[PDB]
Design a protein around this ligand. Structure first.
Ligand code: HEM
Ligand code: HEM
Ligand code: HEM
Ligand code: HEM
Ligand SMILES: O=C1NC(=O)c2c(NCCCc3ccccc3O)cccc21
Ligand SMILES: O=C1NC(=O)c2c(NCCCc3ccccc3O)cccc21
Ligand SMILES: O=C1NC(=O)c2c(NCCCc3ccccc3O)cccc21
Ligand SMILES: O=C1NC(=O)c2c(NCCCc3ccccc3O)cccc21
Ligand SMILES: O=C1NC(=O)c2c(NCCCc3ccccc3O)cccc21
Ligand SMILES: O=C1NC(=O)c2c(NCCCc3ccccc3O)cccc21
Ligand SMILES: O=C1NC(=O)c2c(NCCCc3ccccc3O)cccc21
Ligand SMILES: [K+]
Lengths: 155, 155, 155, 155, 155, 155, 155
């Protein structure tokens, strides 16, 4: 079904953000696992899987709308060097992601692509849940101290 | 069954205390959850539900006694701004509630409303267990330190 | 995540409506139970629980958006003196509630808070289901007679 | 298998009657549900489902006989404005339907299309069962009074 | 609940489209079954059932909004004379249906009938899935050849 | 219970047709199996069994009517040399059979042997279902091509 | 555990190949699903998952050897425009990948990193199995014809 060209461009921009997030979260996960922080490793793994599922739905929607999904261009990974920085890098990426998602919904609404809007709204709900998780972790570090925070994410 | 007017007023006062406690504990629970202190959030949720059940029984007794249950007037909620203050706020509320319960039981005994007395005694037992919980948490904060106390209430 | 100040104000207004509804439906429920109209009592009890669940979600969303949920201010309960009046009072509250939901949805849409909009839309769907129920009961009283209507809600 | 042209014309007339009945009964069902008369709504829904199944068998038979099933022409729906009129409108439609079935069976017999006759006989048995139901409901309204009758069909 | 008069007109227009699709898809299904293409027949039967379920939700919404559901007027069925034409007739119908759905959603949004919008968005999601199915089938006929395509839909 | 002489002659003519069809379908079944077209062979096998059960019911009715069932005379088997001819030979036989069934039913009706008519009507229904199967297979061969048709009947 | 610098460079080169393959196979899979070739889509999906699992193990080994896994640099995807091209693009990519694997194994052997060698050998076995699958599919296209090959991958 021939989709709106700018919708397809917005979907490819969202897709591009998810592809960054897939790799950043996967690498952060395996770093935390290598350091023995396996509760962080596992949670971050599940965050990377969630982004994979979002990218899948985006690819499927783009193809249905008769566009070409861009899996070639990978933007800049934000990789931290310690736990606090890694959480903050994930948070910075998610804040960029939700900004782009909102702008994409505005345009879907304007050209009456209500099904694409519903898909992006669902993704936005998942990203806002990730932001909640990230902000909460960063706050816990301040409340319990870094050493306790890390201790609590070993097992 | 026509109840004693002053018994009904005592029951409405106790109901009023429960209505404050329902909201105060519910808000505290959701604050703790938002901060990632989910074991405190879950416990405080169950405290709120318990107050809801007490309020239900008070409403039912008042109606049986042909009074009007007062769900309109809501007293002052005592909301803390950190874990220590929230616990102390709950405790201050509970100490007021048990003082009022004792006065109501005296009156029920004087007018021979022994069934209303039995209900209030059951509520008093629940409120004293809540006091025990609260005093114990505040004491644990002193024994293990605040960071450890919060750490133990994350998951 | 820093939410829009006016969205938070709208969410607190919706929450305020739910807090009224909780108490009004709960009292109407216990009145109907006291009168032996237990099917009305049971249905109104479940209406009150539904509003409790909506209030919970509103409170959680407000805190996530870094606002303060208002559980202190309780508006005017509309309590009837007989079954017909009680249902109409519920219906009057629900019509106020849905007007406020529609205005809050408008504002969420305009600041691109599409997750808050989706939550409010779900709550609006529940409120229109309650309106349907309430309108239908009032119509049934006219079709079958008050004595039959009440008879069918004894057990 | 090449069927008798006039048989196919009869079958399309019966089909036309079923198509009216599908819509008439389905609308009556949903009107009754909207009014809170859900037992009436459920029974009328099952009547609509029955006509749908008859229409299916007629379409299949017409196609086997190398005719064209007519699903384009929809005759006049008879919609009541109250329970009594709706039942009478169903009954009036059924009495026309059984007259057309009898005339179709006469013709199937004359041209030795014994299988089409057997199908129509089965449909006629169903329509007579519906006539029994409808006459019985209209009689019950007289024996128990409209208010009781409707009361008995709320749940 | 007093609905917007123009929302109700839109809902009756969408319902009119569903009524056409019910009949068109049911006839196509029984044509394919008669021809021995039972996988197509079964798939098209389920499409017809999906439209029946949409029509039901539309009728119920219109009645709740205090409008009259129009089941009397039936627009033009697009019936093909071979498999390729039947799929293209279905696709042409669906493209008109989704155009009308978008226009209806615009109006629901403008008068704040967000529940009607939600129902129409769900239907649109179902219709776009049907468009995907149909476009894919017509593409497969080109890729594998008509003879193979029909072979794969016999059993 | 002594039957009408000419009814018994009709039943014996029908029985004679069924005896031809038993052997013709059984041989066709085993030819297809020998050729590796086992799905055709299995379906034709079940057609032969169907005719065996019809013959059984005819034999039992003739004996009950105190006639002698003719299992001695076997008319001409129509054996094809390839799939299309075999199906056409089956169809030609079925069309003679249904013509004979119709004449027999006319006579049963004239002499008021309604039970024999009902048995012949049931057999006629099965024979018209076989005609449908055969016409449909001949149509599929045209639509998917003989090679694909046979391919789909190998396993 | 401090790894050989050149081993880690080899491991990142193999990882880069896996990252290309993940994306190329995932897109090919979703292209085939969009075209209705679901069996090709599902098989290609499992190939993409396989490469994801290989990339994970390489990431984990690089980190253990105290190197930095390179998830930032993504080489050129080879995307076909039809089924034959897509299979040949996959095969071209696999043949480059196995050449790189062989060179990395040579170097692991020379510096006695026998566990890295074993990991790469396991990956090489999986890639040779993919080469087997792809060569076989391309030959089947020649043996059964493209239309039959695609027909067999519809369901
Ligand atoms: C750095 C790149 C990637 C890595 C290391 C990776 C890793 C993984 C792993 C380890 C799994 C679990 C497989 C299993 O054991 O079942 C997985 C699943 C999955 N991946 Fe990826 N992946 C990557 C990129 C992608 C991309 C780009 C996509 C889509 C565009 C994607 C889509 C999926 C899907 C749909 C699943 C299945 C999730 C489920 O339903 O369980 N992945 N991935
Ligand atoms: C008059 C004030 C209230 C009364 C009498 C009341 C009463 C009740 C009762 C009797 C229950 C059932 C508990 C059980 O399982 O035994 C309940 C459940 C619940 N209440 Fe309340 N409640 C009140 C106010 C509130 C408020 C203000 C909130 C939220 C802000 C709330 C949130 C909940 C929730 C989330 C549940 C459980 C729902 C579920 O289990 O699905 N309640 N309430
Ligand atoms: C106003 C038009 C119609 C409406 C609103 C409608 C509605 C429905 C609904 C709600 C169902 C139940 C679906 C389920 O839960 O599985 C159904 C089933 C069905 N419909 Fe319709 N329908 C309509 C017209 C038709 C027509 C014209 C036909 C055939 C000519 C038809 C044939 C069927 C059949 C065969 C079933 C399956 C019943 C069963 O075996 O359970 N319908 N319909
Ligand atoms: C060429 C002549 C015939 C052949 C090759 C034949 C073959 C068969 C076969 C292979 C079976 C299945 C047996 C089993 O269950 O293992 C069967 C069943 C049967 N046959 Fe025949 N048959 C022939 C003629 C007849 C005749 C002339 C009659 C009656 C007049 C007859 C009546 C039956 C019946 C009643 C069954 C049982 C079917 C059931 O109810 O499952 N058959 N036959
Ligand atoms: O990342 C990428 N996404 C793409 O679509 C792509 C390429 N496309 C070639 C045409 C793919 C195509 C052809 C026909 C029909 C539908 C189709 O989808 C090439 C390189 C990299 C990328
Ligand atoms: O918080 C409140 N509690 C109440 O009872 C109430 C009101 N009463 C109206 C008559 C309640 C009533 C009428 C008839 C028989 C028994 C009854 O119990 C009004 C406003 C607020 C409140
Ligand atoms: O209803 C209320 N909601 C709040 O957040 C709150 C307060 N805030 C302290 C931090 C203080 C009092 C009452 C309330
Ligand atoms: O309601 C309707 N019923 C119909 O058959 C019909 C139409 N016919 C197209 C030819 C259907 C057909 C074509 C070829 C072979 C066998 C066939 O069966 C057109 C419009 C409306 C209707
Ligand atoms: O297709 C049709 N849809 C309709 O509603 C209709 C008719 N209406 C009669 C009054 C329906 C009605 C009456 C009282 C209360 C509520 C009501 O809803 C007449 C003919 C055809 C149609
Ligand atoms: O197919 C057959 N059915 C039978 O009943 C039958 C036979 N019966 C012996 C009675 C012989 C008989 C009875 C009445 C009148 C004339 C007669 O010559 C013998 C061979 C074949 C068949
Ligand atoms: O694709 C990439 N792979 C990487 O490692 C990487 C970056 N490294 C930051 C340091 C990660 C690190 C820090 C301390 C200790 C061990 C560590 O492992 C930066 C950008 C992109 C990439
Ligand atoms: K083939």
């Amino acid at each position: 079904m021939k989709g709106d060209k700018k919708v397809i461009q917005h979907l490819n921009k969202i897709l591009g953000n998810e592809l960054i997030a897939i790799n950043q979260y996967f690498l952060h996960s395996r770093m935390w696992n290598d350091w023995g922080l396996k509760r962080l490793g596992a949670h971050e793994y599940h965050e990377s899987i969630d982004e994979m599922k979002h990218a899948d739905k985006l690819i499927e929607r783009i193809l249905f709308l008769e566009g070409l999904p861009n899996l070639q261009d990978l933007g800049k990974l934000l990789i931290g060097e310690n736990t606090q920085e890694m959480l903050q890098c994930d948070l910075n990426l998610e804040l960029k992601a939700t900004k782009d998602l909102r702008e994409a919904i505005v345009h879907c609404e304007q050209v009456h692509d209500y099904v694409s809007r519903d898909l992006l709204k669902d993704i936005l709900e998942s990203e806002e849940e990730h932001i909640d998780y990230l902000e909460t972790q960063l706050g816990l570090i301040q409340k319990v101290g870094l050493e306790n925070y890390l201790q609590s994410h070993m097992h």
